[PDB]
Amino acid sequence: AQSVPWGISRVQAPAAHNRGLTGSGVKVAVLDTGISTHPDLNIRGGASFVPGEPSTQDGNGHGTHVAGTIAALNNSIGVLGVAPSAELYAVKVLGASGSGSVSSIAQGLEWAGNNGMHVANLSLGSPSPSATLEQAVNSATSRGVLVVAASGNSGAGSISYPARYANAMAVGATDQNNNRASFSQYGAGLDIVAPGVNVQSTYPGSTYASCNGTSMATPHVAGAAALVKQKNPSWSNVQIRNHLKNTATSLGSTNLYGSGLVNAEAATR
């Protein structure tokens, strides 16, 4: 039996699916700890930039979980992603510990731009800026990648890098009441929010687990971007980003929520 995690319903992905929009034909890179083989995922390819971890399999769990929020398969098992037909790529930039370097993340972004990705999900960040990272965000953006990044989990009224950069779409986390999760960073540069509390997704060992974080919010938006791209194949990264913001549901101040809650139904109407 398949179940639909509450956040998938909250962002109204099923309404898009009913219109025939699944993310088919859209390439989404998950720049994370890898993605493990799983019966509810279809991993099309990828690359590793973590020395000593040449495989793109996930030794942590984080990247597998993120991937399932984007693209868990629509079938009779497991869960269901926002964009269940997205072409999913495992871009390992963080090791099994859950950390990497700005160099590995940059290499993943360059890979995305050189390999035709439409969306890059970066459920990662730091409080400090990085020239290396910024350059790679900008390069990927120039190559047509929509970079979607987590605002961070410190609870502060400023957001992490690379989410803070103008060419990243920064995503904060909401709870089931449509309030900002306590940990969700906010402030200047925040673009949008999505569900990030008690988010069930795919997990290594062919299982499912629930997690909290802006890392869980981010893939809802990456998936919504893929739905928008399938509907509007001619659109650029900027056009998709703007449309997601313009069609989001206001939840309160732009400072706490950016444009508000992503709405895949409104974005694909």
Ligand X SMILES: *Cc1ccc(-c2ccc(C)cn2)nc1
Q: Which sequence positions are flagged as catalytic?
A: 32, 62, 215
CA angle, residues 142, 264, 76, in degrees to nearest 5: 110
Least CB distance to ligand X at residue 190 (A): 23
Residue pair 128/35 in contact by the 8 Å Cβ criterion: no
Using CA atoms, how far apart are residues 240 and 49, in angstroms rounded to an integer? 28
On whether 73 is known to bind a ligand per the annotation, the reply is yes
Using CA atoms, how far apart are residues 118 and 216, in angstroms rounded to an integer? 20
Contacts of 228 (CB under 8 A, 6+ apart): 235, 240, 243, 244, 267, 268
Least CB distance to Cl ion at residue 53 (A): 4
Cα-flanking dihedrals φ and ψ of residue 35, to 5°? -140, 125
Which of ligand X, Cl ion, Ca ion, none interacts with 61 (beta carbon under 5 to 8 A by kind)?
ligand X
Residue type for position 78: G
Q: Can residue 55 be called a binding residue for Cl ion (CB under 5 A)? A: yes
The residue from 96, 156, 209, 251 that contacts ligand X (CB under 6 A) is: 209
Least CB distance to ligand X at residue 197 (A): 11
Contact pattern for Ca ion over residues 9 through 48, marking x by CB under 5 A: -------------------------------x--------
Residue type for position 208: Y
User: What is the DSSP code (8-state) at residue 19?
Assistant: T
Q: Which residue has the tokens 């390439």?
A: 27
On whether 168 is known to bind a ligand per the annotation, the reply is yes
On whether 230 is known to bind a ligand per the annotation, the reply is no
On whether 58 is known to bind a ligand per the annotation, the reply is no
On whether 79 is known to bind a ligand per the annotation, the reply is yes
Q: Can residue 134 be called a binding residue for Cl ion (CB under 5 A)? A: no
Give the number of other Cβ atoms within 10 Å of residue 131's Cβ: 9
Smaller CB separation from Ca ion, 65 or 243 = 65
Closest chain position to ligand X (CB) = 211
The site for ligand X (CB under 6 A) is made up of 61, 209, 211
Which amino acids are annotated as binding site for Ca(2+), given as ranges? 2, 40, 73, 75, 77, 79, 163, 165, 168
